[PDB]
Design a protein around this ligand. Structure first.
Ligand code: ATP
Lengths: 835, 116
C-alpha cells in the first residue's frame, strides 16, 4: 500500500514512510547488509539513472537501519549520508568520513558515566585522531619532503601496526575499530550519495572506497549510474598514458589497441569495486505497477486532490491515464496506453513533476481545457528536450503556425516521414521521444474546440511532410538546403491561409513531371486553358462561367493556377479542403464568407518552386452561412488528437494514391457522361478525391475520436472506396442503425464527419453530372447513398427530378457541377476508346 | 497470436492482419465468419503449448538461415519457369504465381521443421 500525495512537497528529504516507491528494495538491501556482517571489502551499489530516486532510497535505508539498531542481533551504526557533490571541492573523503565519525563517537562519550572507562577510551580516540592528522598530508601533497621519512620510521606508539611505514589506511582501519568498540556495534555503514549532479568529484569516492574502506567493520553503500562511473573510470585510465605516447602513436592500429586496453582496465575496476552479486538496480515506475495484463509487483496510488481519502486515492497508471487520455484527447486502447507506458519509463522526478504540475493546476482551475493543462505540464518537464531538438520554445507564440513548423522539424530529425505525424513515442532518441508526447499535447490543444484548426493541422501539419516523403525526396548539405527551400517556398510556420498552402502544394505535385505526361495527379487534375483541334466528343476547354451557384463556387474554391513559362491551371481537393478551413475560421457574417471564395481565385501568383528546371450566388452564401451556424455550435465539442489527424491524413493520402493511378488510364473518348466503371473523367477523379476525404474522416472518426468511447463501424474489412461507392456505402449504412440502437445522434458521436458531409462547398462534388456510377445494379447503392446523406445532414441535397437526370440516360444545376466532365485534362490522349 | 483468446479481440485482431496496408518506398529507392472460428482453437492450442517453447538464439538464427536461402532458390529456379501456356499445368517444368508462393510458404515450414 503506497500512496503518493501530489499536493505534498514530494522531496527526497521530506518523504516519510508509507509512500516509499522502493519498499521492496529498501527491505531487501537492509537484510542483505545485515547478512554480510552476520557471516574483505563490503561495498553495495544501488544502481539507477538520474532522477530515479537514489537519494530517496538511501535516505530510507539509513532510517530503516538506525531504528532498533541495538534491538537486533547485528548492530550497525550509520553515518549521515555523504553527498560528494556538496562537499568542499578539495576536501578529502577520508577527512569527511572521519569528521562525521568523530561526531558520532564524541556524542557517545558524553553518554557514558564511568569516568574510568570514559577517560580510558577517550585517550585512545584522541590518540588515533592525532595520528590521522599527522599522516593526513600523504593525500594533500604535490611532492614528497625528505624530512617525512622520519615519520615513516617512527614506532613511538603502542599500536604495533602489522606493516611498517605511515600507512594511512592502517591508521584509519584501527580508527574504525576503536569507533566500533565505543559505539558497541559490529559494523559501521558509510553511505555515499550519488555523483550525478557533478560526476568529476566522484573519483575521490571511488579511490577512497578501494583504499581506506577495506575493513570488515565498514559497510559502504554508494549509489549513482554505472554508465556515469564508467566514463569517470575510463577517463582516468587515459591519464595513466604518457602524453608523448598519445601524440606519437595517433594512428588507428595502435590507438584502437589502447582503447581496447582502457575498456579492459575499466571493466575490472568496476568489478573490483562494485561486485555484481551486491549491486541493486532501482526499478522504474513501469516495472513496479506493471502493465494491464502483467501482474503489478507493487501497488502505487496517487492523491490527485487535496484532502483526498486513502481509499479515494487512485492508481498511478489511472492517474497518468486520465491526464494522457484527456490531455491528448485520446481514447482507451493501445495508443493511449502507449503514451502512458512511456511516461512511466521516465525518471521518477520527471514523471512526478508532470503529474504534480498537471493536477495542481487542474484542481486550481476549477477552484477547463485539460489539453492546455497537459501542454504546460509537459512543456516544463520536456523543456530540455525541446531545446535540444530545436522545437519552438516561446510561449507567447504558441499557435497553429508555430505548431505545423514543429511537426515538420520533428519528423525531419525523427526521419520517420511515413508515420512521424502520428507523434508516437517511438523514436530511439530520448529527446525526440520526449518531444513526441509534448507535440501530441500541442496538437490536441490547438485543434480542440474548432474545426478550422483541425483541417489546417491536417493539410499544413500532417500533409506537408507527406508532400515531402514524395515529390521532393527524389532530389536528395543538399538535404538541409532542400528542407530550407521547401519550408520557405511553402511558407510553413507563417502560412497566410490554408488555401494558400494548397496552391503551393499544387505546384510541387506539378513541378515533378510525372511519366506518361498525363496531367492527372495525386489529388489534383490539370485542365487546359487553351483550345485546339483534335478534340473528339463534347470535350472542350474548361470555362468557369458554365457552372452556376454552388457549382461555380465549388470550382472557384478548387481552381488553382501556378505562374510558370506557361500558366498551368489545376483543380485540386486540397484547395477545396483549404477553402473549408478558411470559411470555418471566420464569423457567421455574410461579408466574410464572400471573401473566402475570393482569396486566391484572381489575385495570386504561384511561381514555381526553385527546385524546378523551369444574384443566385447569394443563395450559395446563404447555405454556407447556415452551415457555419452548425459549425459554431457543433465544433465546440470536438476532441481531435495528433493520432486522429495523423490517421485521417493517412487514409486520405492512400486513397488519393489509388484514385490517381486507377484513373490515369480510364480517360477514353466516350468517358464523358461516364456510366460504367471503366470510363472516367475530371468529374470521376474529383468525385472520388472528395469522397476519399469524406471517407478517411468517416472511418477513423469512430475509430479514434475521443467523444464516442464505443466503435460504430463494428468488425469487418475497412476497405476504402475507389472507383466505387459500396465501400463507403457499406460503412455509412451500418453506422446509422447502431446510433439508433444506442439512442445517440449523428452530430454528438461523429461531429467531424457530420460537419464535412454537410458542407455545401463539397456538396456539388459528391454527385457531379459526369461522375455517376449508374450501373445495372450499382445504381441502387448510390440511390441508397443519396438517401443516407440526405438523412444525415437533414436536408435533401438533390430533388426527386434532380436525381433522375443523373441516373436516367434541358436542366440547369444550381447545386451540382455541370461542365467538369467536358473538361480536357492536359496530357491525355483522347484517341483510344473504351473497349 | 494475441492474449486472452477473446472471441471479439481475435476477430478484431484478425481484421488488422487482413486489412490492406499501404506504404511508401524508402528514401534510398531508384523507383469469413467461419474463418475466424478455425483460428479460435489454434489459439487454444498455442496458449497451452507455447509455454514449453524454448527458442535459442542459435535456433532462431539457424531457422532463418535455411529460411533465407530456400527463398533464394525458389525466387531463382521459378524466375524463368513462367511460360506461355498452362503454368498451372500438371508438371513441375512450368511455374505460376500460386506455386512460387506455395514453395515460399513451404520453405518457411521446412526451415522451421528441419532445423528445429
Ligand atoms: N519514495 C518516493 N516518494 C515520493 N516521491 C519520490 C520518491 N522517490 C522519488 N520521488 C520523487 O522523485 C524525485 C527524485 O528523488 P531523488 O532526489 O532521490 O532522485 P535522484 O535524482 O536519484 O537523486 P539526487 O537528488 O541525489 O540527484 C523526488 O524529488 C520526488 O519528487
Amino acid at each position: 500500500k503506497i500512496i503518493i500525495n501530489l499536493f505534498a512537497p514530494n522531496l527526497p528529504g521530506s518523504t516519510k514512510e508509507d509512500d516509499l516507491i522502493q519498499k521492496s528494495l529498501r527491505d531487501q538491501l537492509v537484510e542483505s547488509i545485515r547478512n554480510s556482517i552476520a557471516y574483505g571489502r563490503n561495498v553495495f551499489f544501488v544502481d539507477g539513472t538520474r532522477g530515479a530516486g537514489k537519494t530517496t532510497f538511501i535516505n530510507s535505508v539509513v532510517k530503516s537501519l538506525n531504528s532498533d539498531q541495538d534491538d537486533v542481533k547485528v548492530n550497525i551504526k550509520c553515518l549521515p549520508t555523504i553527498d560528494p557533490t556538496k562537499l568542499p571541492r578539495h576536501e578529502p573523503i577520508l577527512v569527511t568520513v572521519t569528521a562525521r565519525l568523530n561526531k558520532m563517537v564524541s556524542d557517545k562519550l558524553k553518554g557514558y558515566w564511568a569516568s574510568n572507562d570514559y577517560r580510558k577510551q577517550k585517550e585512545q580516540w584522541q590518540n588515533h585522531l592525532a595520528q590521522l592528522q599527522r599522516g593526513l598530508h600523504l593525500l594533500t601533497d604535490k611532492e614528497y619532503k625528505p624530512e617525512y621519512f622520519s615519520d615513516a620510521l617512527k614506532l613511538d606508539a603502542q599500536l604495533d601496526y602489522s606493516i611498517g611505514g605511515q600507512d594511512l589506511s592502517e591508521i584509519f582501519e584501527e580508527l574504525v575499530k576503536r569507533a566500533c568498540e565505543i559505539l558497541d556495534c559490529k559494523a559501521i555503514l558509510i553511505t555515499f550519495d550519488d555523483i550525478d549532479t557533478q560526476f568529476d568529484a566522484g573519483w575521490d569516492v571511488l579511490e577512497s572506497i578501494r583504499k581506506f574502506f577495506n575493513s570488515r567493520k565498514l559497510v559502504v553503500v554508494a549509489t549513482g549510474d554505472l554508465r556515469l562511473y564508467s566514463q569517470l573510470i575510463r577517463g582516468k585510465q587515459y591519464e595513466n598514458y604518457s602524453k608523448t605516447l598519445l601524440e606519437q602513436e595517433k594512428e588507428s592500429v595502435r590507438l584502437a589497441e589502447r582503447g581496447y586496453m582502457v575498456e579492459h582496465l575499466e571493466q575490472q575496476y568496476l568489478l573490483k569495486l562494485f561486485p555484481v552479486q551486491k549491486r541493486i538496480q532501482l526499478k522504474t515506475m513501469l516495472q513496479l505497477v506493471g502493465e494491464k495484463g502483467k501482474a503489478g509487483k507493487e501497488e502505487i496510488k496517487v492523491k490527485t486532490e487535496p484532502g483526498m481519502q486513502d481509499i479515494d486515492a487512485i492508481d498511478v497508471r489511472q492517474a497518468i491515464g486520465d491526464a494522457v487520455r484527456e490531455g491528448l484527447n485520446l481514447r482507451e486502447g493501445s495508443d493511449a496506453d502507449m503514451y502512458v507506458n512511456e511516461l512511466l519509463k521516465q525518471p521518477v522526478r520527471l514523471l512526478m513533476q508532470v503529474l504534480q504540475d498537471f493536477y495542481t493546476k487542474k484542481y486550481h482551475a476549477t477552484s477547463l481545457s485539460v489539453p492546455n493543462l497537459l501542454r504546460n505540464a509537459l512543456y516544463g518537464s520536456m523543456l530540455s528536450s525541446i531545446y535540444r531538438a530545436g522545437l519552438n520554445y516561446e510561449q507567447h507564440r504558441f499557435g497553429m503556425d508555430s505548431l505545423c513548423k514543429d511537426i515538420f522539424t520533428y519528423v525531419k530529425q525523427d526521419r520517420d516521414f511515413n508515420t512521424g505525424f502520428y507523434l508516437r513515442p517511438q523514436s530511439e532518441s530520448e529527446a525526440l521521444r520526449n518531444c513526441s508526447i509534448y507535440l501530441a499535447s500541442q496538437v490536441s490543444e490547438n485543434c480542440q474546440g474548432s474545426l478550422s484548426k483541425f483541417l489546417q493541422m491536417l493539410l499544413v501539419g500532417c500533409g506537408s511532410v507527406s508532400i515531402f516523403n514524395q515529390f521532393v525526396t527524389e532530389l536528395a548539405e543538399k538535404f538541409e538546403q532542400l528542407i530550407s527551400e521547401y519550408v520557405a517556398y511553402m511558407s510553413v510556420g507563417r502560412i497566410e491561409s490554408a488555401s494558400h498552402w494548397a496552391n503551393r502544394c499544387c505546384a510541387v505535385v506539378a513541378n515533378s513531371p510525372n511519366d506518361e505526361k498525363i496531367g492527372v495527379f495525386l489529388g489534383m487534375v490539370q485542365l487546359n486553358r487553351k483550345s485546339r483541334q483534335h478534340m473528339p466528343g463534347g470535350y472542350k476547354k474548361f470555362n468557369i462561367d458554365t457552372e452556376n451557384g454552388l457549382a461555380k463556387a465549388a470550382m472557384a474554391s478548387s481552381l488553382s493556377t501556378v505562374a510558370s513559362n506557361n500558366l498551368m491551371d489545376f483543380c485540386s481537393v486540397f484547395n477545396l479542403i483549404g477553402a473549408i478551413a478558411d470559411i470555418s475560421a471566420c464569423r457567421c457574417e455574410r461579408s466574410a464568407i464572400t471573401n473566402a471564395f475570393n482569396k486566391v481565385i484572381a489575385q495570386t501568383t504561384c511561381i514555381v518552386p526553385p527546385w524546378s528546371e523551369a444574384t443566385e450566388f447569394s443563395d450559395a452564401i446563404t447555405k454556407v452561412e447556415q452551415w457555419l451556424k452548425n459549425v459554431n455550435e457543433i465544433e465546440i465539442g470536438i476532441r481531435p488528437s495528433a493520432l486522429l489527424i495523423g490517421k485521417v491524413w493517412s487514409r486520405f493520402y492512400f486513397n488519393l494514391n489509388n484514385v490517381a493511378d486507377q484513373h490515369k488510364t480510364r480517360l477514353y473518348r466516350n468517358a464523358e457522361h461516364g456510366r460504367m466503371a471503366s470510363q472516367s473523367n475530371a468529374a470521376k477523379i474529383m468525385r472520388f478525391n472528395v469522397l476519399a476525404f469524406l471517407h478517411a474522416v468517416l472511418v477513423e472518426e469512430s475509430l479514434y475520436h475521443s467523444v464516442s468511447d464505443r466503435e460504430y463501424i463494428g468488425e469487418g474489412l475497412r476497405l476504402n472506396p475507389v472507383t466505387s461507392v459500396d465501400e463507403f456505402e457499406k460503412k455509412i449504412k451500418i453506422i446509422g442503425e447502431k446510433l439508433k440502437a444506442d439512442n445517440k445522434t449523428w452530430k454528438n458521436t461523429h461531429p467531424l464527419f457530420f460537419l464535412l458531409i454537410s458542407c455545401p462547398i463539397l456538396h456539388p462534388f459528391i454527385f457531379p453530372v459526369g461522375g455517376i456510377n449508374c450501373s445495372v445494379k450499382a445504381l441502387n447503392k448510390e440511390t441508397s447513398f443519396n438517401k443516407l446523406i440526405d438523412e444525415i445532414v437533414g436536408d435533401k441535397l438533390l430533388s426527386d427530378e434532380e436525381w433522375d437526370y443523373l441516373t436516367k440516360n434541358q436542366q440547369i444545376f444550381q447545386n451540382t457541377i455541370t461542365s467538369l466532365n467536358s473538361s480536357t485534362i492536359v496530357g491525355a490522349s483522347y484517341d483510344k476508346d473504351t473497349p
